[PDB]
Design a protein around this ligand. Sequence first.
Ligand SMILES: [Zn+2]
Lengths: 250, 251
Amino acid sequence: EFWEVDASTTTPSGEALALQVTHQNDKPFRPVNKEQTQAAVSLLEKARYSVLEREDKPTTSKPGAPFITSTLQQAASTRLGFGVKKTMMMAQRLYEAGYITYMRTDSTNLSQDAVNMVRGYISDNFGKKYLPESPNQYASKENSQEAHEAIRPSDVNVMAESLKDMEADAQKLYQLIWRQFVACQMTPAKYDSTTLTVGAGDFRLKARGRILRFDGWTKVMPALDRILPAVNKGDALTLVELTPAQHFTK
Amino acid sequence: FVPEEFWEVDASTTTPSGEALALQVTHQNDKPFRPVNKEQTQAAVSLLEKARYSVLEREDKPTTSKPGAPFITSTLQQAASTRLGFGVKKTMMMAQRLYEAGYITYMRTDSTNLSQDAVNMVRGYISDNFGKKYLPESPNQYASEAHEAIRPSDVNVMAESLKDMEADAQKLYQLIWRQFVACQMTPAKYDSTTLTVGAGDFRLKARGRILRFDGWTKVMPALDRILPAVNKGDALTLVELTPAQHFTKPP
Ligand SMILES: [Zn+2]
């Protein structure tokens, strides 16, 4: 058996930052028993934590394409817990009430009027950094009347909340469709794929993930590694909790 | 630090689709699982390692996380301890400093009240700096000597632009400022999933939640992940059981 110790800390600005104890005395931390682990905890409890290093690799996250039947079914399942049957049923009701485009489609195509309508909405409700220079294209081939279209809101100015006549699930499904559509025409989110190294007494702790630099499309559609609060080399952290756990090789 | 009164045992599993699923033991023999020492934890592990894991139930439902009330003396001390690492005397001293300088309301109070002017002031700020979805239709009132909660005299004055206030007082102000603004913002909303699992004489659960709207957490960070698809009756592959205990900074 061996033990691991995770630590919960608070950044200078009061944000939560989870770390894993990786080293003690410059070597790998892996106590073999409760005795050694609890002693490490005592020491960890009394140490002063600070960020020793922050290694960044700039990255950008592109919004996803507007929904089609397959992607709507996957997203509704994941974000809303809706099975395939419920999803198509609610999509059907929405389509028939005239709130969204046809629900059976395998094309991410957006008509010209739809692109202009959403870019107008983005331009009116968000800063200019949220609007790409040109429309975001998904799927090769442009629109032309009777062509297929992605599943999208008939009118972007209509929010799920305004659908007072549709049942709860239909409204939730509409909000999901609405968000994916608006987000697909917004700019990429920008992050710093990072590794934070923290020093505490004789220990070294680490966290890996990404720090948000610009939310971009995520402002309307929350993105599903993990987002770490921004911290800089030299910053002090406040220890709030230590969690030792026991693991077995087999 | 303060060790929790009970240890806990987590299970690392896999679903029929091969996706990782993390669980926590909640019951043994139908009663709450509450091992008081490492020893009774080893026992539970021995029984769980040889058991069969099956999904008993899956629940998906919308949940909300309302903002907390504006600070009063006690809650400010606690938040300052946790978020800034300030001892009570240091907090009160910085508070006294911020007060005598006219930046915050009186720092010794048990009241979560906010004057009509204060409310209108902060809602105005919220309206100008955030979307419409961030401003409650009606103000938020909290349940509850002074007569008003600790809050900034002016919402427009930011900690950064204080003055002859030292570093910690500026930080203490930001904390007070953020709590004040967030208490008048809308709730954060999520879509939660709860999985219940059966194994031998034990029951375990997994809780996950997807953020749908950050609301108040946009200005005041809250202090979890996406659960894989599985259905009632699905068997799970057991990977490893992990006893664990939490040590938390004392009040
Ligand atoms: Zn076709």
